[PDB]
Design a protein around this ligand. Structure first.
Ligand SMILES: O=C(Cn1ccc2c(=O)[nH]c(NCCc3ccccc3)nc21)Nc1ccncc1Cl
Ligand SMILES: O=C(Cn1ccc2c(=O)[nH]c(NCCc3ccccc3)nc21)Nc1ccncc1Cl
Lengths: 123, 123
């Protein structure tokens, strides 16, 4: 009865990334050391147990700024934020440990497991 | 270099639909005759030329209520809103003309073309 549009979810995500790139309807700034990253809380909640847990709570739902642990790796966060908006995870030898540790902190279980498989499949 | 997560966009969209179902971070009511439908403007902009054109404009970006033409078919709209959040288009003989006319009004070109192919593939 239904008609499956196989590229619709990917097209939506690309358009959501275009809106982020233009600061259209962005509602939060994530501060990570000296970095600031704007985003849509909806996308953060959709991709991260940590963000889901923060914004589902009525007490913190309307926060416009989130300060992460100053010890959180800014390149690791940037890689994971790009992943959330693209479905593409840039894992490399130079960044794997930073990305895996950041994904554990953001409670991105499927990404952590993928980093594990990565470590296992690499030297 | 990148690692493609083939189900990430679909998982994001499902989670965005869960947020809609719970009225979490919904920011607009679409009024269609005697019906009210809550949604995320980001998702409306991602799926519809009409909503994109309305909310990209700074003048209308912060509108919390949109009244559609009272002549817009509420079942047609409901079908298309469900499609936006699911990638699944419930086309049937009893609704095809209402959905196609509503998709033209919402400027959902790929959905209109799919309705055309539907008409062509049916008696
Ligand atoms: O699933 C996610 C985000 N998301 C992505 C990856 C991932 C993860 O690895 N762990 C968790 N743990 C929190 C799970 C939880 C707790 C309480 C109730 C329901 C779900 N969450 C993760 N978001 C979501 C869930 C349900 N409705 C709406 C949304 Cl936006
Ligand atoms: O593409 C869409 C929505 N969307 C879905 C289907 C569909 C359609 O069939 N026609 C149009 N016409 C408006 C096209 C336009 C006009 C001016 C500038 C760019 C694009 N839009 C459609 N949204 C979008 C585009 C670019 N950045 C961000 C977003 Cl959210």
């Amino acid at each position: 009865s239904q008609i499956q549009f196989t590229r619709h979810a990917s097209d939506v995500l690309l358009n959501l990334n275009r809106l982020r790139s233009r600061d259209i309807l962005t509602d939060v700034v994530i501060v990570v050391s000296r970095e600031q990253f704007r985003a849509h809380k909806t996308v953060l909640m959709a991709c991260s147990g940590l963000f889901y847990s923060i914004f589902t709570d009525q007490l913190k739902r309307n926060l416009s700024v989130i300060n992460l642990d100053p010890e959180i790796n800014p390149e690791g966060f940037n890689i994971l934020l790009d992943f959330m908006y693209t479905s593409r995870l840039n894992l490399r030898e130079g960044n794997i440990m930073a990305v895996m540790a950041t994904a554990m902190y953001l409670q991105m279980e499927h990404v952590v497991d993928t980093c594990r498989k990565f470590i296992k499949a690499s030297e």
